[PDB]
Design an enzyme around this catalytic site. Structure first.
Site, PDB file in Angstrom:
ATOM      1  N   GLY A 151      69.701  77.796 -23.255  1.00 18.84           N
ATOM      2  CA  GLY A 151      71.065  77.353 -24.499  1.00 18.84           C
ATOM      3  C   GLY A 151      71.822  76.737 -24.573  1.00 18.84           C
ATOM      4  O   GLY A 151      71.086  75.006 -24.296  1.00 18.84           O
ATOM      5  N   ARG A 152      72.540  76.659 -25.689  1.00 22.44           N
ATOM      6  CA  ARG A 152      73.524  75.661 -25.795  1.00 22.44           C
ATOM      7  C   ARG A 152      73.776  74.765 -24.249  1.00 22.44           C
ATOM      8  O   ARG A 152      73.411  73.234 -24.918  1.00 22.44           O
ATOM      9  CB  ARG A 152      74.012  75.524 -27.100  1.00 22.44           C
ATOM     10  N   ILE A 153      74.831  75.261 -24.095  1.00 22.19           N
ATOM     11  CA  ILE A 153      75.253  74.764 -22.625  1.00 22.19           C
ATOM     12  C   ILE A 153      74.175  73.812 -22.282  1.00 22.19           C
ATOM     13  O   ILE A 153      74.601  72.726 -21.516  1.00 22.19           O
ATOM     14  CB  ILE A 153      75.958  75.811 -22.199  1.00 22.19           C
ATOM     15  N   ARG A 173      63.467  82.007 -18.889  1.00 22.73           N
ATOM     16  CA  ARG A 173      62.076  83.524 -19.011  1.00 22.73           C
ATOM     17  C   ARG A 173      60.543  82.515 -19.306  1.00 22.73           C
ATOM     18  O   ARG A 173      60.273  83.332 -19.557  1.00 22.73           O
ATOM     19  CB  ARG A 173      62.309  84.642 -18.935  1.00 22.73           C
ATOM     20  N   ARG A 227      80.110  82.412 -16.898  1.00 22.20           N
ATOM     21  CA  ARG A 227      81.290  83.997 -17.292  1.00 22.20           C
ATOM     22  C   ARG A 227      81.078  84.249 -16.239  1.00 22.20           C
ATOM     23  O   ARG A 227      82.967  85.052 -16.271  1.00 22.20           O
ATOM     24  CB  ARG A 227      81.076  84.130 -18.819  1.00 22.20           C
ATOM     25  N   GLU A 256      86.923  86.980  -9.392  1.00 21.31           N
ATOM     26  CA  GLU A 256      88.622  86.215  -9.833  1.00 21.31           C
ATOM     27  C   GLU A 256      90.150  87.008  -9.939  1.00 21.31           C
ATOM     28  O   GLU A 256      89.950  88.355 -10.043  1.00 21.31           O
ATOM     29  CB  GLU A 256      88.065  85.676 -11.066  1.00 21.31           C
ATOM     30  N   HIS A 274      88.078  78.533 -13.127  1.00 15.67           N
ATOM     31  CA  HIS A 274      87.846  79.031 -14.147  1.00 15.67           C
ATOM     32  C   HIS A 274      87.837  78.190 -15.386  1.00 15.67           C
ATOM     33  O   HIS A 274      88.661  78.543 -16.132  1.00 15.67           O
ATOM     34  CB  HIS A 274      87.615  80.525 -14.508  1.00 15.67           C
TER      35      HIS A 274
END
Ligand SMILES: [Cl-]
Ligand SMILES: [Cl-]
Ligand code: NA
Ligand code: NA
Ligand code: NA
Lengths: 318, 320
Positions: A151-153, A173, A227, A256, A274
């Site tokens: 992904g972008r991250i 995948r 996340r 958390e 976080h």
């Protein structure tokens, strides 16, 4: 001025509250609880929310069109129920990508080079009284990094890592066309081939399990920035305790803010509460995107960043 | 076999490998008072830190001083040069490790990661809630490098991937580089909000980061020092932090190591490290290998691997 009414349940970044009056009347309730909805609120057509949006609260609004979620993750919104009702759900991607990638690299360097521990050594007076901080057994130099998720991250993290001169692999995948990184069709295969595993998949079954950690190996380092956690925390503690892996850096946890006591005792582990997107500038941009999604919806009939499950345009109103 | 003095502490990898070619002569400290008569046949030194001139001059057959570190301030190189003694250092093998540390220190200073970790470890995430949002970030920053060289280029390479613009200040510009050159340090500090000090520490750069530079850096300004502690005017830095003239600092080096002034320890917007820029096992092992391989090359090939600029000597009377 009959301006659209937007519910904000419980706490939200104050920048959202600041900007809603540009176009909207804000309806505040103390908690995300259907019991707090009064008869007058039944004309509410949008929600701005951070965290959990229970279905009974969502279904108390017969005129609800849009839920603008604070965060790239939108687990607290029942998206299947929203989709069934023709309700658009928006999130905040893109504006936090670089900030999250920065945090991941910071956490990686701190885990490998023990910089927070070095700083504690100095601040406790030990540089004066005892001498040099011990040499860090690990380093980024010569390491091979496997990204679980892209992904972008993941692309932003990969871009940073290339500039540090480390080899990069990834597992998803489906492979990405064009990238000069080694693609691994399986997670265990990648963990075998690399010594550093960075988890960016959002994360009930913990994919980073005993088998994955064992494949990572005795020089292995695990970095988790998610996340949520797809890491088996008990299996990680066992692996660290027995030297199955060499170290770990974690910004995210199963429950958390609670961190298991055993993780706090290891000298080769870095722990963060976080903080991946937790700068003023980046949380302000996330707040702006929540509000700008609502403004786009009510002024143009389409949202900026609707989630994949709700590809809807605004319907006619009788 | 040639005899090599090792004074005081040195990385154990140096000690391990010297017996490949050499007899090691150990003394407890770098102090001429510890030299005995039978040590006077010593022909080489391997040293970390200070090499006092009286110790160097106790050895009439001394040919080579292999310094552990890229910096060799602790060796009187002009005196060595006058005696025809070659001095070697350990450049290149630590460049990437030092650049890694600089970026780590920068991120820790901006995003308060060490403080966030302490917040968690003290039980405050549980008991009080989220760590405060960091007022600073790397996003949108402009970085000015004071000094360039190989370490500066390696730092610049990393910073480009974070999407920040890079500028630099040196006495003369570099042809070819696509970075903005600043003719003055104050001018650069005006234009940027993040100043990274990497310049080789000399008498010329002593306290160059002064009140004027810090004031130009400005109220969102962040100072990172991974060069020499003496390049920064420490008292002026403390004053600037105290008064909010600049927004934060990250320091791996200090004016009087290992002493850090109490005032620096009190600021919540400062990250402090005990000179760890090259301090990994892998990188100190490579530095150790280069010290020993310099000595081996001198005595077995007649030239050193990494002689310093001031002693460009090859070994005399060798058919090489
Ligand atoms: Cl927030
Ligand atoms: Cl060492
Ligand atoms: Na592996
Ligand atoms: Na400035
Ligand atoms: Na330095």
């Amino acid at each position: 001025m009959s301006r659209p009414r937007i519910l904000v349940p419980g706490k939200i970044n104050p920048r959202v509250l600041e900007r809603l009056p540009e176009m909207f009347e804000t309806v505040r309730i103390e908690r995300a609880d259907a019991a707090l909805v009064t008869a007058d609120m039944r004309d509410v057509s949008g929600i701005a929310v951070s965290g959990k949006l229970p279905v009974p609260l969502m279904d108390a609004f017969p005129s609800l069109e849009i839920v603008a979620n604070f965060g790239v993750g939108y687990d607290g919104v029942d998206v299947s129920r929203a989709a069934a009702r023709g309700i658009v759900v928006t999130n905040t991607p893109d504006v936090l990508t670089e900030e999250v990638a920065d945090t991941a690299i910071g956490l990686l360097l701190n885990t490998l080079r023990l910089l927070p521990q070095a700083e504690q050594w100095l601040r406790q007076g030990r540089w004066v009284r005892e001498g040099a901080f011990p040499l860090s057994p690990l380093s980024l130099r010569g390491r091979t990094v496997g990204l679980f998720g892209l992904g972008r991250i993941g692309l932003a993290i990969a871009r940073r890592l290339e500039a540090f001169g480390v080899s990069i692999a990834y597992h998803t995948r489906t492979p990405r066309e064009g990238l000069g990184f080694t693609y691994h069709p399986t997670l265990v295969g990648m963990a075998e081939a690399v010594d550093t595993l960075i988890v960016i998949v959002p994360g009930t079954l913990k994919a980073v399990n005993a088998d994955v950690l064992s494949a990572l190996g005795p020089k292995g380092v695990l970095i988790n920035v998610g996340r949520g956690s797809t890491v088996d925390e008990a299996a990680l503690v066992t692996a660290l305790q027995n030297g199955t892996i060499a170290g770990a850096g974690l910004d995210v946890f199963e429950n958390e803010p609670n961190v298991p006591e055993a993780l706090l005792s290891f000298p080769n582990v870095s722990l963060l509460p976080h903080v991946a997107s937790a700068s003023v500038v980046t949380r302000n941009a996330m707040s702006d995107l929540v509000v700008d999604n609502l403004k786009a919806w009510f002024s143009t009939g389409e949202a900026l960043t609707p989630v994949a499950e709700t590809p809807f345009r605004r319907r006619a109103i009788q």
